[PDB]
Design a binder for these strands. Sequence first.
RNA 1: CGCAAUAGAUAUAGUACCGCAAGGGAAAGACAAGCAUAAUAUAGCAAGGACUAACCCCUAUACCUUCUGCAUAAUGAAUUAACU
RNA 2: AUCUUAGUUCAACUUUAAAUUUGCCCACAGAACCAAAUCCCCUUGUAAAUUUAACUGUUAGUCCAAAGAGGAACAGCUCUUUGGACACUAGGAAAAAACCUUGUAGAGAGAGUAAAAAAUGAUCCCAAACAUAUAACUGAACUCCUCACACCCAAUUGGACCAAUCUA
Lengths: 58, 59, 86, 115, 64, 81, 139
Amino acid sequence: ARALDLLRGLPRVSLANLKPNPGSKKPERRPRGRRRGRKCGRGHKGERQRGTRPRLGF
Amino acid sequence: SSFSRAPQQWATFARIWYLLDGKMQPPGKLAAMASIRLQGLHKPVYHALSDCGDHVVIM
Amino acid sequence: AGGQWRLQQGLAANPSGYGPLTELPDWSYADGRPAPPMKGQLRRKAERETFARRVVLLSQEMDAGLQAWQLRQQKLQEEQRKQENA
Amino acid sequence: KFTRSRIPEKVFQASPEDHEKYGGDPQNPHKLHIVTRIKSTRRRPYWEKDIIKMLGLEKAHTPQVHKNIPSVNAKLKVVKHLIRIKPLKLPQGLPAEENMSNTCLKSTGELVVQW
Amino acid sequence: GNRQMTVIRKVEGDIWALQKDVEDFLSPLLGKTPVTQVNEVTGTLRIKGYFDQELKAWLLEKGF
Amino acid sequence: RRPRFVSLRAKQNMIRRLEIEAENHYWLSMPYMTREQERGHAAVRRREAFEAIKAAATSKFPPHRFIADQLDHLNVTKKWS
Amino acid sequence: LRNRVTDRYFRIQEVLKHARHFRGRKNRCYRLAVRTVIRAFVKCTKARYLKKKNMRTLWINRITAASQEHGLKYPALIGNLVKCQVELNRKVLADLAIYEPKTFKSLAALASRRRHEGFAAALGDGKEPEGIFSRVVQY
RNA sequence: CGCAAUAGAUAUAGUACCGCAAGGGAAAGACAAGCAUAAUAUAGCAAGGACUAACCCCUAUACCUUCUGCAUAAUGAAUUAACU
RNA sequence: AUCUUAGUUCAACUUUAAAUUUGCCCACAGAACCAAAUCCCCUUGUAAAUUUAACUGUUAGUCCAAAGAGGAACAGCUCUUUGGACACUAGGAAAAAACCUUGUAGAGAGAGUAAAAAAUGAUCCCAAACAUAUAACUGAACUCCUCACACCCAAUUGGACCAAUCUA
Ligand SMILES: [Mg+2]
Ligand SMILES: [Mg+2]
Ligand SMILES: [Mg+2]
Ligand SMILES: [Mg+2]
Ligand SMILES: [Mg+2]
Ligand SMILES: [Mg+2]
Ligand SMILES: [Mg+2]
Ligand SMILES: [Mg+2]
Ligand SMILES: [Mg+2]
């Protein structure tokens, strides 16, 4: 084929070369820094923030 | 003007004694002239941190 | 600072506007051949060019609009004569 | 309350005393307006911020050209206090497809070729 | 819920030739060249709009 | 205290602006066309411009993907010998 | 303990290195070094505007001194050198006043000449021939 | 793809010690802050622009959190290290 | 709306991805019998708007101009409405969130401007002065100049990178 000819002049494939397909492994989000975490997205004081808002549909 | 280093430096920053009569002069005008001269704000070489102020003698 | 005077004498208010100072080439080579022009000059040529193209385009559109109005006045004022016969 | 202002048309009536005071003429008016902004959109109502954003006058002085037709004047009569309008003057005619890249606008409002 | 697409999936060989052919074949229908994606790795050609039956017929004519 | 004492410099600044806007008044009392003459003369350009906007908005789609880019990542172990 | 920062030392020294020259406990205690270093860098950024403003005011002062040495205020010198179409700026005017006294003497003479021409013209009736130095040169 | 002496068991120990009692319940073993060498010199969020020059000149209302913005209006922080 | 006003849910506003084609401004015409303006669209200047999929966050703020109702037409007073600003940058009025000037961000030991100066009761007055040498100059992070550019909002939302440790 065409690509199979490309592989001949590249380095050997091994577990040091692999990669995920771009766009698959979305990066993670952690509350650290001035953007992600100062209130970590939970908003001002209120039962929204503490994780105590009424049941779904109240 | 081809002066050596130290003589040139001394000539440029030297202090000059300015007389200033005051007969029938208002205090404010004498004050303005004295302020300019004491501060060094009549020397093209002026700066605040160079101590270019001169002497004034008001009689 | 004489911007009032400079504008009273058909000059740019700002000596760094348009004049010999800002647009003549700041340097040449020693031998005499000119230098690759400066970025600011290129950008000002581009913007003045766009200004001129816009000027010509708007003027053309307005003139064509006047001509179209003339044509419509002809074909509505005269085609009523075709109903004035028979 | 504070409301849009409808300017009476009586003001936009050049007099025989105004005509010889500026370089204009009732008959044979001028094609294009060259307009510049000389005042901030800030501290003014939104129905002037939007107008200025529409006439391309976002940046400061930076002159810009517009037609002299009432559809645009109606917009300039709302922002007439944040702009200077001068009439473009062409004492050498519209440039050709040559001389487009060698034009220049002088402070008097005349577009000319090759400086 | 509003992006319609079609995929020609098991394409083998030069997928760009097929892209040119599909663009020629569809351009008259839509009244403009149809935007497309080529994924030369998986070997697929993705096309905006719903053209499943047309493409099936066309790939039948050419003998696939 | 609360009242102010409007200076002369402020008066001159205000008169400058008043004169500029009076000139603006003058340059707006003489339009090249009238309401009816202008009508439609820009229709073609407006239609084409909005069609350009439409064609731009309706062209979004993922970018292509090439085998060469994927296989280039094996270069991260290229060695001399 | 699964993960522990093993290099907090370098992150501290990145901020202390900019504080060795401070005075007090706030040159070795991070909790205070950080706040004062941040204020230092904010002033460092915000001070360039003042640098330009201050050098310009120093130049205006020096030029006023030099021009007063020749019986000519500073409004006159600048407001009537431009009327002679000399685009010398203020940095170089100050440098001339300090380091080239006679050139500055000539410039002051030119300014006084143009000032006199202006007064004579405005005093007259009409558009009598312009002054020998008051003739503009067009581009 | 479990911890490695503030972790991992509370553990060298349910000992020492606290409590009348039920009961509670530790610590640890292998040039950081603080000081000295070397007290200070008009002026002021302690710095910045700088400068030949450390000060002198010009600029400059500490940080977090909560109230509509808060001069410090109020709350919190002596400071270092580890854990959070 | 809520045994609700120290909170929640829905809406409005915000964000992302996606689809499509009209969205805003707007003259003339038009909207009742019993002052400011408003609504609606052809054109025109523009490039945005609607729709779909998916989440969080804010919500009953202060001051100024104006028109009203309550307390005098006052009490720096409660409330409704149109607009601006603030909670974002910078320069001015002495200090100064709310007045005036100004926004899209970096380097410069360059330049032009904006606003901006007063007239004729209780600790200790409070810049110093100046009647008459030609009106211009000074003045920003606004604008121009040489170079470089993603590199100045809270809550929230999207994205690009990454310290140290373990494993292959
Ligand atoms: Mg997680
Ligand atoms: Mg300046
Ligand atoms: Mg232990
Ligand atoms: Mg233990
Ligand atoms: Mg130590
Ligand atoms: Mg105190
Ligand atoms: Mg305390
Ligand atoms: Mg309409
Ligand atoms: Mg800018």
